[PDB]
Amino acid sequence: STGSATTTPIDSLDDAYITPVQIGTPAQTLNLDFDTGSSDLWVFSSETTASEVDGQTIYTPSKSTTAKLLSGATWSISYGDGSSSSGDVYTDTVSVGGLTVTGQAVESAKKVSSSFTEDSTIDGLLGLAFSTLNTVSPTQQKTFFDNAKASLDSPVFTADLGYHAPGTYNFGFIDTTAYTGSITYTAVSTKQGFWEWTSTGYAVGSGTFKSTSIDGIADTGTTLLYLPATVVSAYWAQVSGAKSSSSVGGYVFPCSATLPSFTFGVGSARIVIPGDYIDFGPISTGSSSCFGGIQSSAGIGINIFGDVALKAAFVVFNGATTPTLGFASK
Template structure:
């Protein structure tokens, strides 16, 4: 998740998940995304999930829209599918000795590595793989350490903390803080294929008390050739990749343009230099985007902007310094809402207070998260 101080929300939620590719050399490695076959895109649910993630109440019209959708499911007109709230990409990560494999989300909008575990009350478990510290010879409980994350619906996830070996792409942190859930928000309980989250934001966001813990990336970055990671997401359900410790010049065109990152809130936050819709001027107001789409409307019954699925959406351009990143219009068609109406991939984030560049934007570029600076780099690529 990338944040901007400008006026835009291009959702959705987390960075996704990966499977390891053998490291070409020590200090750098690439991991490829692995798609959750159960995932089904559902626009209102993903917007609500974003509000909850950032501890904000879901807007009443969006909550009502989800209530209506749930009612339709109960009547049988829409197939009941908790996967609509799921994460699209799942991540095999190994924890402990011997290794236990759990599927985690990589999330650049948080800084906790938390998992379902044998400490998790059975009423919160719904088929997830559970980390068992008692079966790991390298696990050690941190005395008196606790963690807790509150969500906008009043729910929370919380628990105790261990240190253990955590390995991704062949590189291991021997004493990584692993936050073991005792209670879990129902939104995560519904995601039966998701075993936890791995945060990639700055460690100042970590919720462990009384002593904050470092993220896996902060612990491993000194072992990398460069203290950075880069993402190359793809559209159309095609697996993308993450590069840790290096920049792969074959994955982008032209040059990378960097923007300074503010760590004040612990996020990868930068200032976009402007926006344009279609072939309009670069300073076009973002809210004008949907006004260019015939038949689009801010639909209270859907909890956001919808449009006729037959419509051709204009491209959306945003600036990073003097560079321009173009998001193709077809990427902004997030998902069908009804048989003829689709849900937009650009939605308001006014109730969150920050603006989020999620996978809709990330799929349109090669993006570098560099802790030197810190800074974030964007480059165009072949789409």
């Protein structure tokens, strides 16, 4: 089997991407944020505290003939940005892009933090990291990808995110029309439950490539590119008037600037992030200070190749017995 679904930016900055997901019988379609940095499939629901719902579409298990309470199971998650959610668990039929899993754990939110409530466009998350990070207790649950894997034509999914445009998530096949040149594969460590890999270095603009190992994770659920403070200072030093602002919470730059590209290494291959991908616009409406898309990881504890970096590539998440990542230009 295979599946193929379009993923659409939630706003003009590509802050996140939503993908429609069918849950239950008859289908209830919710727009979920596919997150390769977490392992829970959770939704706004008929159980979510009413004051914490503001425009999201909700899953109502009582209206699904295939929903079953997973008795005694609870979940609770905290993300890198400080946001959180928790609740109980149903099993139900879940379909993405024509690919169906029966008996998928659907984690129903009873509580969500303010950042979720305030984002009316995101109806929940579909985690695509390794199932060792799933938060369901006392019986940990499998991701949608781990449940689908054995049925897929190939045990892979691909992320093809757009720059200010829709893109695609494919399951079970590699669309050879979706990229240019060849795919370069690189080793993955699953020790922390992430798609963790090691980049071979970087360049700023037309500068020379610096060969250096940068361990990090491929995370579709993170907007920006977070890298060591040495690398980030080297990038922003090439932009007149850029500075790190403790009041704003990272590097800002004059909105009149033209940003340089950023290149990262994947083995002997190179992925080039155009400068425009690094512009996240005014820090507040009408400001002439703009927020940067490359930021220091120093206060996180991990480097994160988020959407700024991934949208520059066709990315293969290979879930074979020895997992690997693949990157191609496009």
